[PDB]
Amino acid sequence: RGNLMGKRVDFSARTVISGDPNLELDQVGVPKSIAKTLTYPEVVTPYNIDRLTQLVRNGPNEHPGAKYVIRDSGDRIDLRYSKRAGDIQLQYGWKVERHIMDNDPVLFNRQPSLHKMSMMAHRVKVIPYSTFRLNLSVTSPYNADFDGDEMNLHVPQSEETRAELSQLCAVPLQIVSPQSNKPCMGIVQDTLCGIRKLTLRDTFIELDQVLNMLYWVPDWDGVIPTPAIIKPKPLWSGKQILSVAIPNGIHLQRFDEGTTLLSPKDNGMLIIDGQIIFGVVEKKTVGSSNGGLIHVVTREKGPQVCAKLFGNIQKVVNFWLLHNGFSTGIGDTIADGPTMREITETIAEAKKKVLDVTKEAQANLLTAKHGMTLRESFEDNVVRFLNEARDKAGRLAEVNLKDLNNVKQMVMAGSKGSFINIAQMSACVGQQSVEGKRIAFGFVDRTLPHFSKDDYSPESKGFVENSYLRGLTPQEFFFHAMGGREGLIDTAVKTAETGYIQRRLVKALEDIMVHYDNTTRNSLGNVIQFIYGEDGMDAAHIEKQSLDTIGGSDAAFEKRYRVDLLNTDHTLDPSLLESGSEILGDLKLQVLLDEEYKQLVKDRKFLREVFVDGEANWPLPVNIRRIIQNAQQTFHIDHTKPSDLTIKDIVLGVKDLQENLLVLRGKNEIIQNAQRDAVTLFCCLLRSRLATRRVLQEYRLTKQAFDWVLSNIEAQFLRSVVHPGEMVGVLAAQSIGEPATQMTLKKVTSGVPRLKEILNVAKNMKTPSLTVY
Amino acid sequence: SEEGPQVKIREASKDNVDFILSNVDLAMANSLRRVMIAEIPTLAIDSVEVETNTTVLADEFIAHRLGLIPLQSMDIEQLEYSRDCFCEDHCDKCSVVLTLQAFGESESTTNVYSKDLVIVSNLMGRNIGHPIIQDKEGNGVLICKLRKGQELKLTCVAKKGIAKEHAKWGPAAAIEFEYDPWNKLKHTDYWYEQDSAKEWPQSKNCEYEDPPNEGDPFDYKAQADTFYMNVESVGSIPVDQVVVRGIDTLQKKVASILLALTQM
Amino acid sequence: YDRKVPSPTGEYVKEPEWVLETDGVNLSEVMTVPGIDPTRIYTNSFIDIMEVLGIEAGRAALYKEVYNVIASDGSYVNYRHMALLVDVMTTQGGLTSVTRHGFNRSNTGALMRCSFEETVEILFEAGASAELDDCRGVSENVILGQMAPIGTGAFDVMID
Amino acid sequence: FIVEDDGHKELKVRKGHIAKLMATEYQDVEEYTWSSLLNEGLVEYIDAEEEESILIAMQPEDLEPAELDVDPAKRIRVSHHATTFTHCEIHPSMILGVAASIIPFPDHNQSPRNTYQSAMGKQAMGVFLTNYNVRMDTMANILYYPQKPLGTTRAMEYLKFRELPAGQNAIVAIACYSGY
Amino acid sequence: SNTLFDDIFQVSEVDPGRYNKVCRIEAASTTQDQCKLTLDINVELFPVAAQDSLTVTIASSLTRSWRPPQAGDRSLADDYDYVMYGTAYKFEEVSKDLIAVYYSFGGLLMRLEGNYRNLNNLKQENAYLLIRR
Amino acid sequence: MIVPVRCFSCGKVVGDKWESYLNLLQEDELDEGTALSRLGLKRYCCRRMILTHVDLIEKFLRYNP
Amino acid sequence: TLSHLRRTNTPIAKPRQLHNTHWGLVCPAETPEGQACGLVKNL
Amino acid sequence: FDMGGYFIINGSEKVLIAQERSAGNIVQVFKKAAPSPISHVAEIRSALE
Amino acid sequence: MNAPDRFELFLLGEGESKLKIDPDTKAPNAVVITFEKEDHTLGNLIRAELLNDRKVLFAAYKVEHPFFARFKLRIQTTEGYDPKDALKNACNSIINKLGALKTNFETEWNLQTL
Amino acid sequence: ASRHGQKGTIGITYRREDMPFTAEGIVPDLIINPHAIPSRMTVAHLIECLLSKVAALSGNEGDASPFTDITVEGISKLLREHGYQSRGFEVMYNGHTGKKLMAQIFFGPTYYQRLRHMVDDKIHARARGPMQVLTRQPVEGRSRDGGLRFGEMERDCMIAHGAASFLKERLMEASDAFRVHICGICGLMTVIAKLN
RNA sequence: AUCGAGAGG
Ligand SMILES: [Mg+2]
Ligand SMILES: [Zn+2]
Ligand SMILES: [Zn+2]
Ligand SMILES: [Zn+2]
């Protein structure tokens, strides 16, 4: 374990890290003193000898330079103090151990390495200071802070190794992660706060700042966008400038809570061809969310486009924020005098509730519910009362905070903060817990020697009603310290336990690989799975989509999918199809729709069988909402003209498309049936969305766009397949172990201890339970 | 007087000038104050050789303090940058050599000020190198303290530089800078609990501008063209000279750009 | 418990139901009690499920337990990873632990198993039993400093 | 402190004793010392097993009698509900160590932050000793211009901080600026 | 290249929801009883009190890079006093003989409801909205 | 360990003002804020220089050589 | 230095917790992080 | 300002950390886990002066 | 250790030219000027004065990294107007305004008493 | 770090002209991010800044001792008596441009400590270097020109990525590769390789 | 080398 599975390596660097808004995502800022030490053995060829000769002329004491020359004989020339490092005549076939230089592929790493995303490849960018510099939207997979963190760097030594770094482990390749089938990176901190401050309808920009922001976009087209206001004064909206960073052909739809198509509170998000229509931009739009900007762009334009998108968004928002400013002080912790009066009134009211319950318990007039102790009921009730009091005081505070409250600004943006933060800082920090219960009688029948014996009051057992603004009393201080000490012990223990758990998982699944027969075997030929994930899809190519045959009344299902040419009232309106009236009452063209509806009903029955609770949103490979939205733009569909789609076209084309979807390839019955199984749910999705009434009335496609959608679905499906050689065992182990490392803290074992019980198949669980229906 | 930016001096001393800069685009005023901070030259100690140091301080400590000492720089344009002069290390046309020797002869602690600095090089009749002394008791900056027996004997070389290279070459301390004291342009959105007008204090410069009319709409085409400035000098260069040389330096940079265009 | 159920109109609506939660477990005898639904009975003691309802039910209960562990934190991990873990724990007929006595007592090569725990006793017994290592495990090739059958190494490149 | 009956319960320490103590301090008459309080039965040593049998106040004002118009910004102190006191705390801030006694307003921070600062204050540079120029230590770091804190703690006077400080009073802005 | 819609509205409602420089405005069409308007308006630039009557015009022109209006030679297409530029994003058929159009002027929003305009207000980014005293 | 020459923030020279400050306190029975204002130190950036300075040299000077 | 000269060690049934009896005797806050938390203490 | 309390061994300054221990001569009553045939224990560890 | 020498903020290096000029891509009659060894002091003023020329359609500036003292200025003008001439006029206007400022300040100073 | 667990490293140093400035000309010695206040809940940091502002202005000391009746309101009333916004906010102008910032800045003295963790005590790059006598692997330690450790976790990540060649290069050519002759019958490292 | 202590994320 110390010299074979892991050892010390040459060509390695390690340094304190800091952030840089002006570094591209896949770039790493390398100190010049480090670049002079790490070398690459470039072989002299006619393509490099004019460059390598000058490099070696520079020498090792300055960069770009070189440190050694290796000849055909195998002898080594030390350029530091060889007498002939001025008359070096380079011959082809030699090697120059040249200095590391810009846009070299290097392997950047932070420890612990719970992730393949913990060791990603970066392009070298030699910078003139002693710290490793990296873009902020790469801090998340590394879990890197800039408070003293050190990170390590490794240099490949062969063209094959550089190829592996740049075409497998590169940062843009790792944007969408198979763990959680979502992006692992997003816009954070200053960028995330300013992007919300900037996307408001109150945010307007004048010509000078607009032009500076426009030029700040590196991939700018030079077309100054026409302002949203012209006559009184040329004024741009922050959304207008920000959409310059968004590539053309990007469509994003999302509705949040009270979102009309007029979005009164500027909720949700609507981006129509890289120009946002409505919606304040915050962590839902631009974070590492499922279906956010990053997911859509990475899947639509590609990893490199998204990687530049990170930089463009940062460079516009950071500039706007730099010239707009943002701060925070104790002012943002104060609520109105009326508010604090209500808050302390609420706290006293809950204290009176507890006192009444306590006198009731002392009178032996309590009705302990079945199962639990009298005292257990008393505790439960008091803890519930105090938790409610803290939360109600917190809501009073949060309601009282204006929209200028910088803490509320950060919380609304999602950059930093939560409800409990505001509540404890400005209303009441709440109840303190040790080992999951209130403060115990560490003394004889009392918590502190300043209390009388047998005192179960909120104050005596660890209820802090003061806020961090107000100030904690000595007993409240000690109780808070007791809880916080428990928190530190939990942290320092969970780390070691989860490291051991992660190592056991990785060692147990390290040899699991998808072979070329689409199976999932190990170092013995033993089969683990016959199809990886029972569907054979790379998890990075999978997104939550709704199965539209699951939900709704049977009446709405009929209204959506039923096509009856044998009824004047339930037939395709002739404005939805060129063959409108010519198709009414067609007997032969109704057996097709009847088989379509029959398979749709069978789909609904099957899916309701599989997904009992009727949950329609499930992670499936190919996103068809986006393909339809694209087809409505690449072919500029208008909804007044009728389509040119024969019913035969739609139905038989979707049938053929189902036939054309492949995961396995063999020509025998059992492999054909395994293929037919592995595509069943996706074909259910296909039938739910590619229905004749749907394709005609819900998005009026033409035959051109329809064939385009068919081919695009086929392509993306074939591109979402697992790649043979994928080490899905290590990926699975790390994808389970990393979220376990972030586990930290109702009478059930959970978290790391329960995971340990599951993994060691412990016979004597601490909480065995039977759930009887 | 002359068409263009106008100046009205509110108050003036040998250390401060408070004035109003009218009919100026803002970027010019900002560039002027940046230049007054960063770009105008000064004489300061840029080398120290320590023959003896028996003090409780370190040589580099004292060297830092000596570099921070203010020295006379009125006739500084009559001095050469050592990087531009043709001497070996320094000459009389690019540098000024100061000498400082002090000894603890008295039983009581013997302080070492900047009045104890001795010019050794030949000034050639220019106001240069005399340490600035504004202490009312005639001494200078307290540079060191000596116990009976300790001594400090050293030679400094003072060269030409600007605050960009090191802050010791800064002639100005603080530049007070305000505009639109009523926030008519709405250039900042005030933060409040109950009332912005009551929780934010009123500017001394509010009196010099008429209060807005509440019934007036927002002047969406207004621009900042009247600034309130106060320049404070360390004393190495007089305040009037600080601002005048700031202006001259800025237009000299612009002329350098123009000459580069000519050469292209 | 609140339950989502298809109403007669076809929608999905909440239909609350009384549910019994025990503090102990004897699955074999409780599910025979009349007046309950023996189709829906469940336990957090998946080993009891393995020895009562078969191995596949144990697999499903294992996935459910791990899933609830992940979801307690509000975290999400794709089905495939946890499914792979559970299949590995299950694909040998019973429940194999991720532990010294478990996956590291298998048909795998001795060099792989010695790289986890009980490092030297494994090699001793391998020598005594005269074991043979295929060197098709990744740990073997790591120890031998050879390119391993992993991704880029799961195939060979030759000339045309 | 020792609490005893006297026309109510009151601490045996009186303002005359404080006057004599401070007179002894100002000499830097028979000097009035801590041992004199200990011998005159004004103060008492208590271990953990004995403070199980005692009731401790928190302020000498908790022995004041009772009888609304309050300051809304102050902490919610509780009417102590208690009597039969035997002792009083010398000062609640005395529950802390030498590290945490440097923290300003630690009663407004969450406890892990106070733990972190107590761990990091031992890494702050400053004058660790006035005789640093006379010792030959394996390693030493000293601030050029140590500054005594603008936010002090009445515990610092006994910890000699403002004589041997370990940081500087930096003009700090809280701002998003250039993104660095 | 010409006008696509023109009417006069009596403003009914003004709503400054959480904003300091923008109000959403609800207006009923003068000389119509089935046409209504919702519109975000920069009330700092062009203040709009209730019960005002405002001439509203949707245009098409009078793309390439935006140019400042030279020194005065350029001729506008607007004796109006508040002009914006947006994009249509939904063509909602509210009912039979009822259509509504949604425009986004840089995130400011317009919802217009009527029936008669048919050879106008097409699926086009081109949308200059002009407003007269 | 001895009076800084200039305020770190703005650069106003403060090294000439230490003995004057001490004499204003002890000699003239003044308080710290009034002395700081009298010595021309109006900005708190300048004021924290003199006000919060520990002059450790007068202790180093107590060692013999 | 002061913190080092007032330090305790516990050679190892819930020791790392801040017990109630610690009031006034050992510091509630000053403890190491990591696997010495609660075992090493400062008076 | 030096406070003392340390030793000087081979020139290096050394500190004796306080070792925490359970006091002796105290009788304590403990329970035993369910799979144990004895229900309670009364221990005392007899430390001399 | 890795810190660059301070004089690299204002002293041009070997072969470094004060002005570099490159025609822009995908914008007619536009150019990008790289100023070496300068910062906001000059770029902000030049852009502000360029924005006052009624025949200048676009003018922006940016410092791609605070580490390096250099910036980029993009200028696009009306046809039949070389952007270099627009820069010349802006610079001359700046110098005239500064000269007027210096003259007026010297007048007002000589008017004062202290 | 401040005295409240707010540790940080320098990310960049700006000269005075580029720094934001108050109307009085005062400039921050230091600038911290608001995104580190709400998660950590260290109000005392902000109260310290307020109290220190008032103390420097009035030439008094700030009693930031625990368990006193020193409220935020009293400090704020004193500060407003000194002509500054009661909650420590201050209008600040941008250095690059000179125009005010829309947001006002919480600005004031705060005690900060310089810690023993400096960068040039941490830099380390190796390339080739000294080797261990027994394992023929790189030695351990920056102070020994040693190498970094490519532990089992890093091996796991490289396996998960599918980069077999990089894994081999790290484990052999960047460490302890060796050529040994073996018998085709004994199968052991036995052959006497009298090479030349 | 060994052993140990302290500390950083
Ligand atoms: Mg960190
Ligand atoms: Zn010379
Ligand atoms: Zn100052
Ligand atoms: Zn053999």
PDB file of N, CA and C in Angstrom, chain A residues 343-383:
ATOM      1  N   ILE A 343     -40.745  39.397  18.214  1.00  0.00           N
ATOM      2  CA  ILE A 343     -39.894  38.211  18.297  1.00  0.00           C
ATOM      3  C   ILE A 343     -39.737  37.762  19.745  1.00  0.00           C
ATOM      4  N   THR A 344     -39.419  38.704  20.633  1.00  0.00           N
ATOM      5  CA  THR A 344     -39.308  38.352  22.043  1.00  0.00           C
ATOM      6  C   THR A 344     -40.672  37.988  22.626  1.00  0.00           C
ATOM      7  N   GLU A 345     -41.751  38.588  22.109  1.00  0.00           N
ATOM      8  CA  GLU A 345     -43.093  38.195  22.527  1.00  0.00           C
ATOM      9  C   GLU A 345     -43.382  36.744  22.154  1.00  0.00           C
ATOM     10  N   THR A 346     -42.998  36.343  20.941  1.00  0.00           N
ATOM     11  CA  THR A 346     -43.141  34.954  20.512  1.00  0.00           C
ATOM     12  C   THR A 346     -42.332  34.012  21.394  1.00  0.00           C
ATOM     13  N   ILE A 347     -41.097  34.397  21.721  1.00  0.00           N
ATOM     14  CA  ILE A 347     -40.252  33.551  22.562  1.00  0.00           C
ATOM     15  C   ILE A 347     -40.885  33.368  23.941  1.00  0.00           C
ATOM     16  N   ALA A 348     -41.365  34.463  24.539  1.00  0.00           N
ATOM     17  CA  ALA A 348     -42.021  34.369  25.843  1.00  0.00           C
ATOM     18  C   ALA A 348     -43.306  33.549  25.771  1.00  0.00           C
ATOM     19  N   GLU A 349     -44.059  33.669  24.673  1.00  0.00           N
ATOM     20  CA  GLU A 349     -45.274  32.876  24.509  1.00  0.00           C
ATOM     21  C   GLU A 349     -44.961  31.388  24.450  1.00  0.00           C
ATOM     22  N   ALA A 350     -43.916  31.012  23.712  1.00  0.00           N
ATOM     23  CA  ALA A 350     -43.538  29.603  23.672  1.00  0.00           C
ATOM     24  C   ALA A 350     -43.032  29.137  25.032  1.00  0.00           C
ATOM     25  N   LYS A 351     -42.338  30.014  25.762  1.00  0.00           N
ATOM     26  CA  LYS A 351     -41.908  29.657  27.110  1.00  0.00           C
ATOM     27  C   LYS A 351     -43.111  29.395  28.011  1.00  0.00           C
ATOM     28  N   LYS A 352     -44.156  30.216  27.883  1.00  0.00           N
ATOM     29  CA  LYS A 352     -45.384  29.992  28.644  1.00  0.00           C
ATOM     30  C   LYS A 352     -46.059  28.681  28.249  1.00  0.00           C
ATOM     31  N   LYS A 353     -46.064  28.358  26.952  1.00  0.00           N
ATOM     32  CA  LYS A 353     -46.571  27.062  26.500  1.00  0.00           C
ATOM     33  C   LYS A 353     -45.826  25.917  27.177  1.00  0.00           C
ATOM     34  N   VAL A 354     -44.494  25.999  27.202  1.00  0.00           N
ATOM     35  CA  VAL A 354     -43.702  24.958  27.854  1.00  0.00           C
ATOM     36  C   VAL A 354     -44.037  24.888  29.339  1.00  0.00           C
ATOM     37  N   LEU A 355     -44.176  26.045  29.990  1.00  0.00           N
ATOM     38  CA  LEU A 355     -44.481  26.067  31.418  1.00  0.00           C
ATOM     39  C   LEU A 355     -45.835  25.429  31.703  1.00  0.00           C
ATOM     40  N   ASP A 356     -46.835  25.724  30.870  1.00  0.00           N
ATOM     41  CA  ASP A 356     -48.146  25.104  31.039  1.00  0.00           C
ATOM     42  C   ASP A 356     -48.061  23.595  30.869  1.00  0.00           C
ATOM     43  N   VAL A 357     -47.356  23.139  29.832  1.00  0.00           N
ATOM     44  CA  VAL A 357     -47.175  21.704  29.631  1.00  0.00           C
ATOM     45  C   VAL A 357     -46.459  21.083  30.824  1.00  0.00           C
ATOM     46  N   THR A 358     -45.497  21.807  31.400  1.00  0.00           N
ATOM     47  CA  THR A 358     -44.726  21.277  32.521  1.00  0.00           C
ATOM     48  C   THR A 358     -45.585  21.133  33.772  1.00  0.00           C
ATOM     49  N   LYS A 359     -46.413  22.134  34.071  1.00  0.00           N
ATOM     50  CA  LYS A 359     -47.315  21.994  35.212  1.00  0.00           C
ATOM     51  C   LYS A 359     -48.317  20.871  34.971  1.00  0.00           C
ATOM     52  N   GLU A 360     -48.757  20.709  33.721  1.00  0.00           N
ATOM     53  CA  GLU A 360     -49.639  19.597  33.393  1.00  0.00           C
ATOM     54  C   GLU A 360     -48.961  18.259  33.672  1.00  0.00           C
ATOM     55  N   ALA A 361     -47.703  18.110  33.259  1.00  0.00           N
ATOM     56  CA  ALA A 361     -46.989  16.864  33.518  1.00  0.00           C
ATOM     57  C   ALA A 361     -46.786  16.642  35.012  1.00  0.00           C
ATOM     58  N   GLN A 362     -46.467  17.706  35.756  1.00  0.00           N
ATOM     59  CA  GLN A 362     -46.304  17.579  37.202  1.00  0.00           C
ATOM     60  C   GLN A 362     -47.603  17.169  37.888  1.00  0.00           C
ATOM     61  N   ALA A 363     -48.753  17.578  37.347  1.00  0.00           N
ATOM     62  CA  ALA A 363     -50.040  17.178  37.914  1.00  0.00           C
ATOM     63  C   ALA A 363     -50.447  15.756  37.536  1.00  0.00           C
ATOM     64  N   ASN A 364     -49.602  15.037  36.793  1.00  0.00           N
ATOM     65  CA  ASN A 364     -49.910  13.694  36.297  1.00  0.00           C
ATOM     66  C   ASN A 364     -51.221  13.701  35.519  1.00  0.00           C
ATOM     67  N   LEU A 365     -51.445  14.779  34.774  1.00  0.00           N
ATOM     68  CA  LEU A 365     -52.597  14.895  33.895  1.00  0.00           C
ATOM     69  C   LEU A 365     -52.213  14.723  32.433  1.00  0.00           C
ATOM     70  N   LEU A 366     -51.001  14.245  32.165  1.00  0.00           N
ATOM     71  CA  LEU A 366     -50.567  13.983  30.804  1.00  0.00           C
ATOM     72  C   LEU A 366     -51.127  12.659  30.303  1.00  0.00           C
ATOM     73  N   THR A 367     -51.313  12.578  28.989  1.00  0.00           N
ATOM     74  CA  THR A 367     -51.738  11.354  28.315  1.00  0.00           C
ATOM     75  C   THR A 367     -50.589  10.941  27.399  1.00  0.00           C
ATOM     76  N   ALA A 368     -49.652  10.167  27.940  1.00  0.00           N
ATOM     77  CA  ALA A 368     -48.540   9.681  27.136  1.00  0.00           C
ATOM     78  C   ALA A 368     -49.060   8.777  26.029  1.00  0.00           C
ATOM     79  N   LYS A 369     -48.741   9.127  24.787  1.00  0.00           N
ATOM     80  CA  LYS A 369     -49.176   8.324  23.659  1.00  0.00           C
ATOM     81  C   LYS A 369     -48.555   6.931  23.741  1.00  0.00           C
ATOM     82  N   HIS A 370     -49.180   5.980  23.050  1.00  0.00           N
ATOM     83  CA  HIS A 370     -48.700   4.606  23.062  1.00  0.00           C
ATOM     84  C   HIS A 370     -47.281   4.521  22.511  1.00  0.00           C
ATOM     85  N   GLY A 371     -46.481   3.630  23.094  1.00  0.00           N
ATOM     86  CA  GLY A 371     -45.105   3.448  22.673  1.00  0.00           C
ATOM     87  C   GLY A 371     -44.049   4.225  23.440  1.00  0.00           C
ATOM     88  N   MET A 372     -44.275   5.512  23.685  1.00  0.00           N
ATOM     89  CA  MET A 372     -43.263   6.358  24.305  1.00  0.00           C
ATOM     90  C   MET A 372     -43.567   6.617  25.781  1.00  0.00           C
ATOM     91  N   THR A 373     -42.514   6.985  26.513  1.00  0.00           N
ATOM     92  CA  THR A 373     -42.591   7.293  27.935  1.00  0.00           C
ATOM     93  C   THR A 373     -43.370   8.591  28.148  1.00  0.00           C
ATOM     94  N   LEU A 374     -43.884   8.765  29.367  1.00  0.00           N
ATOM     95  CA  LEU A 374     -44.432  10.056  29.768  1.00  0.00           C
ATOM     96  C   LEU A 374     -43.396  11.157  29.569  1.00  0.00           C
ATOM     97  N   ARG A 375     -42.192  10.951  30.111  1.00  0.00           N
ATOM     98  CA  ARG A 375     -41.121  11.927  29.947  1.00  0.00           C
ATOM     99  C   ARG A 375     -40.743  12.098  28.487  1.00  0.00           C
ATOM    100  N   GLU A 376     -40.778  11.018  27.704  1.00  0.00           N
ATOM    101  CA  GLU A 376     -40.476  11.142  26.284  1.00  0.00           C
ATOM    102  C   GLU A 376     -41.484  12.046  25.591  1.00  0.00           C
ATOM    103  N   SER A 377     -42.768  11.899  25.930  1.00  0.00           N
ATOM    104  CA  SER A 377     -43.781  12.797  25.385  1.00  0.00           C
ATOM    105  C   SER A 377     -43.529  14.233  25.822  1.00  0.00           C
ATOM    106  N   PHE A 378     -43.201  14.429  27.100  1.00  0.00           N
ATOM    107  CA  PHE A 378     -42.923  15.774  27.593  1.00  0.00           C
ATOM    108  C   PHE A 378     -41.782  16.420  26.819  1.00  0.00           C
ATOM    109  N   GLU A 379     -40.661  15.706  26.694  1.00  0.00           N
ATOM    110  CA  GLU A 379     -39.523  16.211  25.931  1.00  0.00           C
ATOM    111  C   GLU A 379     -39.940  16.553  24.512  1.00  0.00           C
ATOM    112  N   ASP A 380     -40.399  15.549  23.756  1.00  0.00           N
ATOM    113  CA  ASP A 380     -40.913  15.766  22.407  1.00  0.00           C
ATOM    114  C   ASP A 380     -41.707  17.067  22.290  1.00  0.00           C
ATOM    115  N   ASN A 381     -42.668  17.279  23.195  1.00  0.00           N
ATOM    116  CA  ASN A 381     -43.484  18.489  23.115  1.00  0.00           C
ATOM    117  C   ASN A 381     -42.661  19.751  23.367  1.00  0.00           C
ATOM    118  N   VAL A 382     -41.785  19.742  24.375  1.00  0.00           N
ATOM    119  CA  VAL A 382     -41.009  20.948  24.679  1.00  0.00           C
ATOM    120  C   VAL A 382     -40.050  21.288  23.539  1.00  0.00           C
ATOM    121  N   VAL A 383     -39.346  20.283  23.016  1.00  0.00           N
ATOM    122  CA  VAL A 383     -38.442  20.500  21.889  1.00  0.00           C
ATOM    123  C   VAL A 383     -39.208  21.019  20.682  1.00  0.00           C
TER     124      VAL A 383
END
